[PDB]
């Protein structure tokens, strides 16, 4: 995350490859289910031998004896509908919920986050020289309407996508942050309204970020789970 600061986000998880390395983020939606981005995977039938999800630590590379660290093998991937840019990962085991590891709520089907809503992005991805890129960083964004977004994006943003306000300072989620959550605090709950996806340009001054809009796809998520 560029332009952010060290923080905690107990529903954000780290996806780990065969070499034990962080490659993408994810969002804890059920005790054994992680919602993430399709662009984190080479195919929908990717060989996921050796892949795990790590939870409960602020560090990208924690000491393996770390008390709050949970490490769970990936059981399987399920690709979302065409145009969703989503993947669900089932874990080989159900994680244990505590103060460091918490489920984020799913939105109601078709729900539109109102403009001006404040949301948080989080991840262990690149900071482009704006911070320590080996701890969890967070940034606060502000939702804008798709109509307002599509002025600068010239109509490219789909109904299946949502946007946040372009920031004057370079701020946003880039490489290694894909699949993590856009979490919005509304109606007395943190709710997973978006998933971080690749954009044409990342953390670019005055350019609105675009996320996949989770409320469009919640029928599929519930069905799969």
């Amino acid at each position: 995350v560029v332009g952010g600061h060290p923080g905690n986000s107990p529903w954000t998880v780290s996806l780990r490859n065969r070499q034990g390395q962080h490659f993408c983020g994810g969002s804890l939606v059920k005790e054994q289910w992680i919602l993430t981005a399709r662009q984190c995977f080479s195919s929908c039938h990717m060989p996921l031998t050796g892949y795990e999800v790590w939870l409960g630590t602020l560090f990208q590379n924690p000491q393996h004896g770390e008390p709050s660290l949970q490490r769970v093998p990936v059981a399987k991937m399920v690709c979302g509908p065409s145009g969703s840019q989503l993947v669900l990962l089932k874990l080989e085991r159900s994680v244990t919920l505590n103060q460091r590891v918490a489920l984020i709520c799913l939105p109601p089907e078709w729900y539109v986050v109102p403009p001006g809503t404040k949301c948080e992005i989080a991840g262990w991805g690149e900071t482009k020289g704006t911070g320590n890129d080996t701890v969890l960083n967070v940034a606060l964004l502000n939702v804008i309407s798709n109509q307002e977004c599509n002025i600068k994006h010239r109509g490219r943003v789909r109904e299946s996508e949502m946007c946040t306000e372009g920031l004057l300072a370079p701020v946003g989620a880039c490489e290694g942050d894909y699949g993590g959550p856009l979490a919005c605090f509304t109606h007395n709950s943190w709710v997973l309204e978006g998933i971080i996806i690749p954009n044409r340009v990342c953390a670019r001054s005055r350019w609105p970020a675009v996320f996949t809009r989770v409320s469009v796809f919640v029928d599929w998520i519930h069905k799969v789970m």
């Binding site: 918490a102 984020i104 709520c105 943190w190």
Partner: peptide, 4 residues
């Protein structure tokens, strides 16, 4: 869900 959704408590921090």
């Amino acid at each position: 869900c959704g408590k921090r």
